[PDB]
Design a protein around this ligand. Structure first.
Ligand code: HEM
Ligand code: HEM
Ligand SMILES: COc1ccc2c(c1)c(CC(=O)O)c(C)n2C(=O)c1ccc(Cl)cc1
Ligand SMILES: COc1ccc2c(c1)c(CC(=O)O)c(C)n2C(=O)c1ccc(Cl)cc1
Ligand SMILES: *[C@@H]1O[C@H](CO)[C@@H](O)[C@H](O)[C@H]1NC(C)=O
Ligand SMILES: *[C@@H]1O[C@H](CO)[C@@H](O)[C@H](O)[C@H]1NC(C)=O
Ligand SMILES: *[C@@H]1O[C@H](CO)[C@@H](O)[C@H](O)[C@H]1NC(C)=O
Ligand SMILES: *[C@@H]1O[C@H](CO)[C@@H](O)[C@H](O)[C@H]1NC(C)=O
Ligand SMILES: *[C@@H]1O[C@H](CO)[C@@H](O)[C@H](O)[C@H]1NC(C)=O
Ligand SMILES: *[C@@H]1O[C@H](CO)[C@@H](O)[C@H](O)[C@H]1NC(C)=O
Lengths: 552, 552
C-alpha cells in the first residue's frame, strides 16, 4: 500500500507518501531534480561524464606498479592521495545516522537509540506487496535452496590473494568488537554501544566488567602464567561471565573481555596477544612515568592500543585486502582541513558484508595436527598445546578460502550462512541492486552479469527470476571476483566507506585527541605510529615468529 | 605534588608530569611554542595584533544601528556574518569531549561515559597544595560569607535589558532538558544522556516514560481538559513518576515529561504550551498525511518541535540576551561548507554559568495577586486559576532581576546559590582567571577590576586576597555588567560557545537531516522555519496574548 514501496526515488532523494497513493521525492542536495531525482543538474552531467568506474580505478590502483612506487616516496602526493580516499569513501555514509530496523524514516528514536545497528538503506514497508518492495514473487527463494545451490563449498577454493589464518582470525577478532548482535532483542540490535574501535573486546563491554579483568597494579590487565607463558586469567578467578560449553574443565575457561572468544582458539590467540600487548605498554608508560598510577597507566594504555589497532587495520589488513600498489596511510592529519564527522554508528549492512565465513578452511592445521571444526571449537588446550609461536607459524602458512566467487561456505558454518540469509530477510532488506545504486554503483542487468559465468548465474535465475530481486548477502559470495581477488566490486564498494568511517571517525583521531600528550608522551605516541601486525607478534610471542596476513 | 598543579601550560597546551617534579607542555596546534606554549608563532603575532577585544566587538555590535539595519537586509552579508558567529564561537569547545569530574586526562572513560557532564577545563589534582592548584590559602573563603557579603539581594535590582518572566521561565524550562544533575551519583553526573535539545523534558527521559505520556492516537501526547482548556494528564492516570509534595491533592499532580516541572507553575505553564504545541503539529501533519499513523506522526512532531525550539532560542531568546542590532539567524546551511561536529556533551561549566537565579523577582505577580516564593512553589492551582492567557499577559509585563552586577540573589533560593559555590568547589574547579584565559579573555588584575566598583571589590579582596584565586561562579554574578546589560564579558564569552555548539551541534541540523522530507513535507519544514515565541503562544493560548522576552 505504501506508495513508496516501489523505491521510486533515484539518485539518493527521499521518498515520502504525500497521500495514500501519492509519493514525493526530496532531491535535496542530490544534484538531481525531477519527479524521481533523475534529471541531473548541468554540473552533475559534467561529473558523470568524468567519473572512472570502480573497476577502472581498481585497475589503475592494482597496476602501474612502477609509477606507484615513485608516488609512495613523494609524501605530499601519498598524503594527498590517501586524503582523497578518506574523504570520498567516508562521504558515502550518513553521519549523524538515519534509519534502522524499525525506522524507515529519520525520527529522534532512530537517531538516539544506541541499541540498534543503523541502516544505510531504510527497511521495506511492512505493507509492501513483495519482500523487495514491489518486484518479484510473493516470497524469495527458500534460503536452504540458495544456501545449497550456490553458497555451500564442495572443493575448497583458496583465496587468490593469499589471505592466511593470521588474517582470517584477526578479522574475526577485530570486527567482533563492533558486531555483537543482541539476540535477546533480535537482529538489528547491537550489544556494542561504543559502535567502533573501542577495544571493548579486550577491556570488556562495561566498567563493572573491565574492573573484574584488571589487576589494579601498574595499569595492567589480570593474567596468569602457564609454562613460562602469560595467559588470560580464568572466569573462576576474575569472575567474568564468559560463554563456554559446560564440559570445559574450568582452568581453561579464559576471561579476556568479549564473552565469546572462548569458543574459538584463533580468537583466544589474539585475545592473548593483545592482553600481552596492553601490559607491555603499561611497563613502557611506567618507565616514563614513575609518578603515574594505575588508572592513568590503564586509560593511556587503552588509548595506545586503539591507535595500534587503527594503524594495523589500515596499513597491513586493509592494505593487503586491497592489493593496491599505493601505500595506504594512517594519518589523522589528512582530515584536519577536511569536513569530517568524528563519530560513527555500526550499520546492519556492514555486519552482513563482513560475514566472511568462506575464509575458513576445512581443517585447522596447527603444525603437525589438523583439526576438524568440531575438534577446534572451544578447545583451548590446543592453544595451550602448541602455544602462540607454534600457532603463529602455522597460521602464517595456511591459506583461507576465497570469499566471493561462489560455493565456498564451509558446510560446518552453513547454519550461519543460512541464518544470514534468513535474518537479512527479517530485517526487511532491499535488493542487491538498490544497494548497488546506493553506493554509486551501476546495477546488474542479469544473474549472468553478477556471477561472471552461467552455471550458478542461470541456477540463481531459476530461483530469483528477476535480477533486481536478487538479495545482497548471497550476491556478495556468488559474485565475479575482480581478477585474482577475494572480493568483487560490490563487497569493496559498500564496505570500504563503512570501514574507513568507523576507523577514522574515532575520537583519538580528532585534533584535540591526536597529540603526543594524549598518549603519555612522544614515546607512547610512537607505539601507535609504528604499530604493525609483525611488531604486534614480534613483541608478544616467544621468538619473533615472522607473520603477515599473507600465506607468503 | 602534581608538577602540573600550577596550571603552568599557557595558550591551551596540555601539561604532563614527565617525572615526579617535572612537567611538559604539549603546545600542539596551540599556535605557540616554548616551555609554556607562551612564545607565539610569527603568524600568531599577526592575529594577536588584529583581534578586537570582546568589548570592542560587543560595542560595534550594540551600536551603529543604522549601519546594522542595512546589513540585516543584505542576506548574503547577514548569512556570512552569522556563519562567522557559529564557527568562531563553536571553535571554542572540544568535540569530541575531553576531561570530566574524575578525569584530568583524556581517557576513553572520560570520553564515552555519557553519565558525566564533560569539563572544559580539567579538574584540579587532588594532590595540589591549594584548592586553586598552588595559589591562595589552604582553603577558599567560607561560602556563607561570600553568599552574604556579595551575592544576596537587598534591593531588587531589575534587569537593565528588560527580561520579563516569559524569558526567565523559558530559560528555566529550556535549559532544564540538558541540566539534570544526577544527585544520586553527585555533581558532575547528569541524567540527561541526550546531552542537548532533544525535548526530553516534553517527551520523557526514556522510551518507557514517553510511552506512558503518549495517547497513541494521531501521534498526540496524552492530555486532559479542565475548563475548556487542555492540560497535562495526571500522574495518577499516565502513571509517570513526578516529584510533588505529598500534600498536593492529586488531580493537580501533572505528568508532562520532566519529573520536576511540577514544583514551579512557570515551568508547568511552558510544560503545557509545548504539550499544546505538539498536538497542534500532529493535527497539521495528519492533514497532510491521511495515510500516516501514530508513531510517524509522533516521531515527526518531536522533530518539528526540536527545530522550533532551536529557532526560537536563536532568533528570540539569544537575540534578546545579546542586544545586538544584527539579526541572529537559524540557518543550518551556514555550516554546510564549514568543518563542524554535529555532536555535543553538556559541560559542568555551562551548568554553572547558567545559574541565573537573580532573574527571580521577590514576588510572582500574576495579575492582581502577588505571590511569595513559598506560595508559588509547586502550587498548580495558580496555573489553573488565572490560566495561561492571564499568566502570559502577567509574565510578559514583569521584569526579572539583573544577573551580573552584584548582590541580586533572592534570599529564597539562597540555599541554591551557596550550593553552587560549594559544589563547584567539590568538583575541583579552577580559578575564574584560568577560565577567562581558557576563552581567549584577558584575566582580571584585581577584584576591583572585576566588579567595576570597590565596595564589593575590596569586600571580596578581604576574602580571596589574590585576584587569581577568585572563583568562577561568584565572579559571574559580582561582575561589572557591560553597559545597560544583564551580564558581563565573562558570562557571554564562556557561554555563547557552549550555547551555540549545543544548539547547532544537533542531528536535525546535519545535511542528511536538514531537508523538507525529514519533517513531513515543506509544510512541516516551515512550522520550524517560521517558529517564534510569539507564535508559540499565539497558536496555543486562549486569545493571542501578545508576548515577548522583553517587559516592553
Ligand atoms: C572458528 C571460526 C569461526 C566460527 C566457528 C564462526 C562462527 C560463527 C557463528 C556461529 C556465528 C553466529 C551466526 C548466527 O547465530 O546467526 C558467526 C557470526 C559472525 N561471524 Fe563468524 N565464525 C568464525 C570465523 C569468522 C571469521 C574469520 C569472520 C570474519 C569476519 C567471521 C565473521 C562473522 C560475523 C561478522 C558474524 C556476525 C557477528 C554478530 O552479528 O554477532 N566469523 N560466526
Ligand atoms: C521558581 C524558580 C526557581 C527555583 C525555585 C529554582 C530552584 C533551584 C534549585 C532548588 C536548584 C537545585 C540546586 C542544588 O540542589 O544544588 C536549581 C538548580 C538550577 N537552576 Fe533553578 N530555580 C528557579 C529558577 C531558575 C531559573 C529561572 C534559572 C535560569 C537559568 C535557573 C537555573 C538553574 C540551573 C541551571 C540549575 C542547575 C540544574 C541542574 O544542574 O540540575 N533556575 N534551581
Ligand atoms: C581489493 O580492494 C579493497 C578491498 C577492501 C578495502 C579496500 C580496497 C578499501 C579502500 C579502497 O577501496 O580504496 C577499504 C577501506 N577496504 C576495506 O577496508 C573493507 C573492509 C571490509 C569490507 Cl566488507 C569492505 C571493504
Ligand atoms: C550580550 O551579548 C550576548 C549575550 C548572550 C549570548 C550572546 C550574546 C550569544 C551570541 C554572540 O555572542 O555572538 C549567545 C549564543 N549567547 C547566549 O545564548 C548565551 C547563553 C547562556 C550563557 Cl551562560 C552565555 C551565552
Ligand atoms: C518516476 O518513476 C515512475 C515509476 O517508478 C514513473 O511513472 C515516472 O514517470 C518517473 N518519473 C521520473 C521523473 O523519473
Ligand atoms: C531502543 O528501542 C527499542 C524499541 O523501540 C526498545 O525496546 C529499547 O528499550 C530501546 N533501547 C533504549 C536503550 O532505549
Ligand atoms: C560511569 O561512571 C560511573 C562511575 O565511575 C559508573 O558507576 C557508571 O556505571 C559508569 N557508566 C557506564 C555506562 O559505564
Ligand atoms: C582439544 O585438542 C587437543 C589437542 O589436539 C586434544 O588432545 C583434545 O582431544 C581436544 N579436545 C576435545 C574435547 O576433543
Ligand atoms: C614557564 O613557567 C615556569 C614556571 O611555571 C618558568 O620557570 C618558565 O620560565 C616559564 N617559561 C615561559 C616561556 O613562560
Ligand atoms: C496555592 O494557590 C491557591 C490558589 O491561588 C491557593 O488557594 C492556595 O492557598 C495556595 N497554596 C498555598 C500553600 O498557599
Amino acid at each position: 500500500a505504501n506508495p513508496c514501496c516501489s523505491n521510486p526515488c533515484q539518485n539518493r532523494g527521499e521518498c515520502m507518501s504525500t497521500g495514500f497513493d501519492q509519493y514525493k521525492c526530496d532531491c535535496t542536495r542530490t544534484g538531481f531534480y525531477g519527479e524521481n531525482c533523475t534529471t541531473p543538474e548541468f554540473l552533475t552531467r559534467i561529473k558523470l561524464l568524468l567519473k572512472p568506474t570502480p573497476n577502472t580505478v581498481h585497475y589503475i590502483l592494482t597496476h602501474f606498479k612502477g609509477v606507484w612506487n615513485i608516488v609512495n616516496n613523494i609524501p605530499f602526493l601519498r598524503s594527498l592521495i590517501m586524503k582523497y580516499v578518506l574523504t570520498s569513501r567516508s562521504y558515502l555514509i550518513d553521519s549523524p545516522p538515519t534509519y534502522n530496523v524499525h525506522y524507515g524514516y529519520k525520527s529522534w528514536e532512530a537517531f538516539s537509540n544506541l541499541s540498534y545497528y543503523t541502516r544505510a538503506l531504510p527497511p521495506v514497508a511492512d505493507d509492501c506487496p513483495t519482500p523487495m518492495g514491489v518486484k518479484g514473487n510473493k516470497e524469495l527463494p527458500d534460503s536452504k535452496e540458495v544456501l545449497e545451490k550456490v553458497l555451500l563449498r564442495r572443493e575448497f577454493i583458496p583465496d587468490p590473494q593469499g589471505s592466511n589464518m593470521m588474517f582470517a582470525f584477526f578479522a574475526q577478532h577485530f570486527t567482533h568488537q563492533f558486531f555483537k548482535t543482541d539476540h535477546k532483542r533480535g537482529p538489528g540490535f547491537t550489544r556494542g554501544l561504543g559502535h567502533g574501535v573501542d577495544l571493548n573486546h579486550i577491556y570488556g563491554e562495561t566498567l563493572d566488567r573491565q574492573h573484574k579483568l584488571r589487576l589494579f597494579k601498574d595499569g595492567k590487565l589480570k593474567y596468569q602464567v602457564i609454562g613460562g607463558e602469560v595467559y588470560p586469567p580464568t572466569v573462576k578467578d576474575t569472575q567474568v561471565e564468559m560463554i563456554y560449553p559446560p564440559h570445559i574443565p574450568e582452568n581453561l575457561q579464559f576471561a579476556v573481555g568479549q564473552e565469546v572468544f572462548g569458543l574459538v582458539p584463533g580468537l583466544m590467540m589474539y585475545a592473548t596477544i593483545w592482553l600481552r600487548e596492553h601490559q607491555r605498554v603499561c611497563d613502557i608508560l611506567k618507565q616514563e612515568h614513575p609518578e603515574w598510577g594505575d588508572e592513568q597507566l590503564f586509560q593511556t594504555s587503552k588509548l595506545i592500543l586503539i591507535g595500534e589497532t587503527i594503524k594495523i587495520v589500515i596499513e597491513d589488513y586493509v592494505q593487503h585486502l586491497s592489493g593496491y600498489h599505493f601505500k595506504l596511510k594512517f594519518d589523522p592529519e589528512l582530515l584536519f582541513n577536511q569536513q569530517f564527522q568524528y563519530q560513527n554508528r555500526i550499520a546492519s549492512e556492514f555486519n552482513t558484508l563482513y560475514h566472511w565465513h568462506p575464509l575458513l578452511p576445512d581443517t585447522f592445521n596447527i603444525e603437525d595436527q589438523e583439526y576438524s571444526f568440531k575438534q577446534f571449537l572451544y578447545n583451548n588446550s590446543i592453544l595451550l598445546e602448541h602455544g602462540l609461536t607454534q600457532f603463529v607459524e602455522s597460521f602464517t602458512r595456511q591459506i583461507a578460502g576465497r570469499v566471493a566467487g561462489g560455493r565456498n561456505v564451509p558446510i560446518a558454518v552453513q547454519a550461519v550462512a543460512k541464518a544470514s540469509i534468513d535474518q537479512s530477510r527479517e530485517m526487511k532488506y532491499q535488493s542487491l541492486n538498490e544497494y548497488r545504486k546506493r553506493f554509486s554503483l551501476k546495477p546488474y542487468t542479469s544473474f549472468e552479469e553478477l556471477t561472471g559465468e552461467k552455471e550458478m548465474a542461470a541456477e540463481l535465475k531459476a530461483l530469483y527470476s528477476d535480477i533486481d530481486v536478487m538479495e545482497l548477502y548471497p550476491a556478495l559470495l556468488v559474485e565475479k571476483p575482480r581478477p585474482d581477488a577475494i572480493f568483487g566490486e560490490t563487497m569493496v564498494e559498500l564496505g570500504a566507506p563503512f570501514s574507513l568511517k568507523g576507523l577514522m571517525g574515532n575520537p583519538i583521531c580528532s585534533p584535540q585527541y591526536w597529540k603526543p600528550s594524549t598518549f603519555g608522551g612522544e614515546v607512547g605516541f610512537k607505539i601507535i605510529n609504528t604499530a604493525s601486525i609483525q611488531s604486534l607478534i614480534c613483541n608478544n610471542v616467544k621468538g619473533c615468529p615472522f607473520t603477515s596476513f599473507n600465506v607468503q
